[PDB]
Design a protein around this ligand. Structure first.
Ligand SMILES: C[C@@H](CO)CCC[C@@H](C)[C@H]1CC[C@H]2[C@@H]3[C@@H](O)C=C4C[C@@H](O)CC[C@]4(C)[C@H]3CC[C@]12C
Lengths: 283, 759, 81, 31, 50
């Protein structure tokens, strides 16, 4: 009727060749102002893991991973308590806590979800009723979103281990020393970035649909920085404040603001190399 | 007599923005007070002429004594050091009183002193401070100047049995701006232990508690007086909002007195460091509960809550704190009746600058809050506006309309897609019949040579204004059947392609129901209503969505650059029809608040204009101030004009709804402009928030290296523009030239030079 | 790990590398990155542009800008020596 | 090799030309 | 009739403001500052341009 606001369609499939369930959800939304908005979600779950030897291999690697994270958390508690307190001015220890927290969250989610499979058993009792696999897909998505960030930080941590000669050491020194002062300009640049974002959201955020939301405005500005979006629709959106905004943004934040980042890095590297070269006139 | 509503999820941005502003201002003010307190901590151990008490009245005084001196008088009070002399207070050991006492009022009773020694002493009594007029002349060099003893009665002007009046007046004069918490973050007496910073914690605690209590009472207590709701008009009755503000302030006051008592007299060994924690909890909790109770405000009580909070703050500042200091003075006077309540002189200008910055910060934060409200008060019916305009554009088949060139398919288009859209079973309630105002020119056009268009449209002339008949011109008996329908002065300027149009022309009502409207459409089609010159067509009717509460002005335009070809353009502008007579809606309050700020800036500018005199021109600051004032005034005036125009149009409509049009379009224009201007104004403020980042020793260079290299950047841009005009005078480019990253080298060189010159 | 199932531009592993290289040339689509994962996708896109076009591509130029000046100075001094 | 190692030598050349012009002008006008 | 000639009109307005700025600035160089001193070839262009 005219009163409806949302419609869902749900089902799932097995594809017995490989061992991967696939749950399918289709949403259709009816805004009160008229129109239709579709959305879809296909999720490849896996619930019957232990069949082949590779599955036991993966389980063993999971156990070893739990042992490793337990080892790291123990050696971190030992270091925080039985050694220097408030050792947070390093950025190399504030990274370990993030990694261990993300890992323990992932393990907790896995224990919560994997141990919760009785719905499959209920479906296997009688197979003429709708299976309820929606929660499992959501938790699988959440687990993937955590593992994908955990692996990123684990890879990032490797930078601590590359100082095996003069060149890498000096590059690391330049990169670290150039972070204390780039922080201020980053803040001052993001303030103007958000000022442009809110201005665009308030002005064009009603007829363009690229500026229809604040984060969408931020993404549009980043795309313009990459050089992807053209203002061929902004004039239709607005003829007074359109070209003015576009020109001001592409001039002030692409010819002036974006070069201080180059200048600071260039000067820091130059002074660092000069200092390290002068470190040989004394020896 | 309580309720846990949790009705919806649509957050109310007003409370969130107010809380965010109140915490940000506290953070920055605490940052400033950190240095303002470190200076006092370092200084832990003219006002008048050079005080001199160098005398030799006594001998054999190889002991020590303390001679305290108090410079009484309004707005000036400070103690003095001990009675240390040139020979350790021994025989004839008295030096000039060259102690730093910058507190000294005018020709008032600025005289008070006392002496405390190890019991008694010989006849060593320094006469007085012989300072008549050398630097400021706060008093004359004449007093009793004779033998004295401990607790000297150093009275004066420019047993004492009446201890009552003297004790009360002294205690009030000393504590009228110290105990008073609000304006004490500026006038803390030195050597005290109340730390100059937790004074800000008390203030932020009061603000957050006021906000929380008011947010609870509004929308959490509607049983005892069920006076709230639909029967409660948001307009300030001046009998109710002030009452709830007062009662909220009174009920929340005791916990403040408890936390202050835990602060004062704490060094109680170290409990002060606990108290901060408590505050950092309570305010948060307060904010939290606001963010839970304010999410379900009806759209009219939000202004009432702000007024209640303002009244509550103004109540605890206009008598409650004075009452507390008065009762404290009486308690002291009636309990224990205590009788005593270029090297290193550059810091004075530093303290003055810090006080000025602290005073300007509050005005900046208030202006930021009011402009944030003016901008995002209704930042919830904003995505809905986009969805509504997209839906209207979609169901009108905008693509099918923007791809018509001949002036013949317009009739099938209207008969097929538009008329079924206007009428039907329910079919998108309209609120207004359509119109077909039309212009002729009278300057008959001729088709261009083969080809769509050579450069542009041309051959314009004088728009026709005479009367005509069925078919065209034939006025025989009386008034023509197709009158001109003279344009209104409000609502015009569509700004098409060939020229700038107006609201004048020959109109058609296009009937009421589908059958009669279609028949009349065909009737006027066959009788040659639209085949002649007929520059424009101007189909535009209305739209209104009750579910969200937004109107939409829809305008369709076909334009004729030449006889035979057309150009299509449509505009759907959504807005919210908020009348001026609707009470004290938030936009009206923000508009009347912005005018006060504009007046304040104008007054502050004129007070320096006339102080320095004329020829203050040629200074960038004056131009910047006079442009900011103009922008603020323009914003306020445009918003007020939109509010007035909405009411005018709505009254005109409700007058003759059945067969009128009333053209709400102009309102949709103003609501746009009043939303653009503010959007720019806030922008400026944000930019300012970047510049004031220079108050960091490390980050002060990022502004200097950009203000120093401005001539070079302008020269490079000049080179760019001259090469660009040369590129066309011989008759890409910008991309290759900008790929040079030319500004980078100038910025790098300037940065290197500034860093080198920083040490 | 995030987009390796539904975009089709990050299906294999080397496909991700080639897609990032194309992004460096400014050939992003972003019509599927934002709808495949509304959160953690735009985060990746935004944090990828800020750490490449602003920081990590201004370091090659710094080295090449410093070394050129140094070598010209040394060579000119040697010629004038 | 086209955007990282070969494009930036052009910018380095431009930067060095600007610096040399600046230094020569400063030396001439301060002599 | 166009969306570019309005930018030209705005530039013309800005140009008129600049000429006002330079004419309100030159009278002070003759009244307060010592007058009848044009043998500089620089005060000569400043007035003829205006
Ligand atoms: C006083 C000093 C500090 O000690 C500041 C230095 C400013 C200076 C570098 C700026 C000021 C005006 C600029 C020129 C412009 O006016 C038109 C052009 C024409 C174009 O074909 C090439 C470029 C050129 C010459 C510009 C070159 C750079 C210039 C000379």
């Amino acid at each position: 009727d005219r009163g409806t606001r949302a419609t869902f369609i749900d089902f799932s499939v097995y594809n017995a060749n490989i061992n991967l369930f696939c749950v399918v959800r289709l949403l259709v939304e009816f805004p009160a102002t008229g129109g239709v908005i579709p959305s879809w979600q296909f999720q490849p779950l896996k619930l019957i893991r232990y069949v082949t030897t590779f599955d036991f291999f993966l389980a063993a690697c999971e156990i070893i991973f739990c042992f490793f994270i337990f080892y790291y958390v123990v050696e971190e508690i030992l270091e925080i308590r039985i050694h220097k307190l408030h050792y947070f001015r390093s950025f190399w220890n504030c990274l370990d806590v993030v990694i261990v927290v993300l890992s323990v969250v992932a393990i907790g989610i896995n224990i919560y979800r994997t141990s919760n499979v009785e719905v499959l058993l209920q479906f296997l009792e009688d197979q003429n009723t709708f299976p309820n696999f929606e929660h499992l897909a959501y938790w699988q998505i959440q687990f993937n979103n955590i593992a994908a960030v955990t692996v990123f930080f684990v890879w990032i941590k490797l930078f601590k281990f590359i100082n095996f000669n003069r060149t890498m050491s000096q590059l690391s020194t330049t990169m670290s020393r150039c972070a204390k002062d780039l922080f201020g300009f980053a803040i001052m640049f993001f303030i103007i970035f958000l000022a442009y974002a809110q201005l665009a959201y308030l002005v064009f955020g009603t007829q363009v649909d690229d500026f229809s939301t604040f984060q969408e405005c931020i993404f549009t500005q980043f795309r313009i920085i990459l050089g992807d979006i053209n203002f061929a629709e902004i004039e239709e959106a607005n003829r007074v404040l359109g070209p003015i905004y576009f020109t001001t943004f592409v001039f002030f934040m692409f010819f002036i603001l974006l070069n201080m980042f180059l200048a600071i890095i260039n000067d820091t590297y130059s002074e660092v190399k000069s200092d390290l070269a002068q470190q040989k006139a004394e020896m | 007599r309580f309720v846990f509503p949790e009705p919806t999820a649509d957050v109310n941005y007003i409370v969130m923005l107010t809380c965010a502003v109140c915490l940000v201002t506290y953070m920055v003010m605490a940052a400033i007070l950190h240095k303002l307190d470190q200076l006092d901590a370092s200084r832990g151990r003219r006002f008048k002429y050079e005080i001199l008490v160098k005398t030799g009245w006594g001998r054999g005084s190889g002991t020590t004594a303390h001679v305290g001196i108090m410079l009484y008088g309004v707005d000036s009070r400070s103690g003095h050091r001990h009675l240390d002399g040139d020979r350790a207070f021994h025989r004839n050991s008295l030096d000039i009183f060259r102690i730093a006492t910058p507190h000294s009022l005018g020709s008032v009773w600025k005289i008070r002193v006392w002496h405390d020694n190890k019991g008694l002493s010989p006849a060593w009594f320094l006469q007085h401070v012989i300072v008549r007029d050398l630097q400021t002349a706060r008093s004359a060099f004449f007093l009793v100047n004779d033998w004295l003893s401990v607790e000297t009665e150093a009275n004066g002007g420019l047993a004492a049995l009446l201890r009552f009046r003297r004790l009360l007046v002294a205690e009030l004069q000393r504590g009228f701006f110290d105990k008073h918490i609000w304006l004490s973050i500026w006038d803390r007496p030195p050597r005290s232990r109340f730390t100059r910073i937790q004074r800000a914690t008390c203030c932020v605690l009061l603000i957050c508690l006021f906000l929380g209590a008011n947010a609870v009472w509004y929308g959490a207590v509607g049983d005892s007086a069920y006076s709230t709701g639909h029967v409660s008009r948001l307009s300030p009755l001046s009998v109710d909002t002030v009452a709830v503000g007062l009662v909220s302030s009174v009920v929340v006051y005791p916990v403040y007195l408890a936390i202050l008592f835990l602060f004062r007299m704490s060094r109680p060994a170290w409990c002060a460091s606990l108290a901060h924690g408590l505050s950092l909890l309570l305010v948060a909790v307060a904010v939290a509960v606001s963010g839970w109770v304010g999410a379900s405000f009806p759209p009219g009580v939000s202004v009432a809550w702000l007024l209640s909070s303002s009244a509550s703050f103004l109540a605890s500042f206009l008598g409650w704190e004075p009452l507390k200091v008065l009762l404290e003075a009486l308690y002291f006077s009636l309990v224990a009746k205590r009788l005593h309540p270029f090297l290193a002189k550059e810091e004075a200008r530093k303290v003055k600058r810090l006080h000025g910055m602290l005073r300007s910060l509050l005005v900046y934060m208030l202006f930021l809050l009011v402009t944030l409200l003016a901008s995002y008060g209704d930042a919830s019916c904003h995505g809905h506006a986009y969805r509504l305009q997209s839906a209207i554009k979609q169901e009108l088949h905008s693509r099918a309309f923007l791809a018509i060139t001949r002036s013949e398919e317009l009739w099938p288009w209207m008969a097929h897609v538009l008329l079924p859209y206007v009428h039907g079973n329910q079919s998108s309630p309209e609120l207004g019949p359509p119109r077909l105002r039309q212009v002729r020119l009278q300057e008959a056009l001729y088709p261009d040579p083969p080809g769509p268009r050579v450069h542009t449209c041309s051959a314009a002339g004088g728009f026709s204004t005479s009367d005509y008949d069925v078919g065209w011109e034939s006025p025989h008996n009386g008034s023509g059947t197709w009158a001109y329908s003279a344009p209104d002065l409000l609502g015009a300027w569509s700004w098409g392609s060939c020229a700038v149009y107006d609201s004048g022309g020959y109109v058609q009502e296009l009937g009421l129901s589908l059958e009669e409207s279609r028949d009349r459409l065909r009737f006027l089609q066959l009788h040659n209503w639209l085949d002649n010159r007929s520059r424009a067509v101007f189909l535009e009717l209305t739209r209104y969505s009750p579910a969200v509460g937004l109107h939409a002005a829809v305008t369709l335009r076909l334009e004729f650059p030449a006889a035979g070809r057309a150009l299509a353009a449509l505009s759907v502008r959504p807005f919210a029809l908020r009348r001026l007579s609707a009470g004290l809606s938030l936009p009206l309050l923000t508009s009347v608040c912005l005018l006060l700020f504009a007046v304040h800036f104008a007054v502050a500018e004129a007070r320096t204009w006339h102080r320095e005199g004329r020829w203050r021109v040629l200074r960038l600051g004056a131009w910047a101030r006079w442009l900011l004032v103009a922008l603020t005034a323009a914003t306020a005036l445009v918003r007020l004009a939109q509010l007035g125009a909405a009411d005018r149009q709505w009254t005109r409509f409700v007058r003759g709804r059945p067969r009128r049009f009333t053209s709400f379009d102009q309102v949709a224009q103003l609501s746009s402009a009043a939303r653009g201007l503010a959007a720019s104004l806030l922008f400026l403020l944000l930019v300012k928030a970047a510049q004031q980042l220079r108050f960091v020793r490390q980050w002060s260079v990022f502004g200097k290296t950009l203000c120093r290299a401005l001539p070079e950047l302008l020269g490079v841009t000049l080179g760019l523009v001259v090469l660009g005009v040369a590129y066309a005078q011989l008759a890409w480019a910008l991309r290759l030239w900008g790929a040079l990253r030319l500004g980078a080298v100038i910025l790098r060189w300037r940065y290197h030079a500034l860093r080198g010159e920083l040490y």
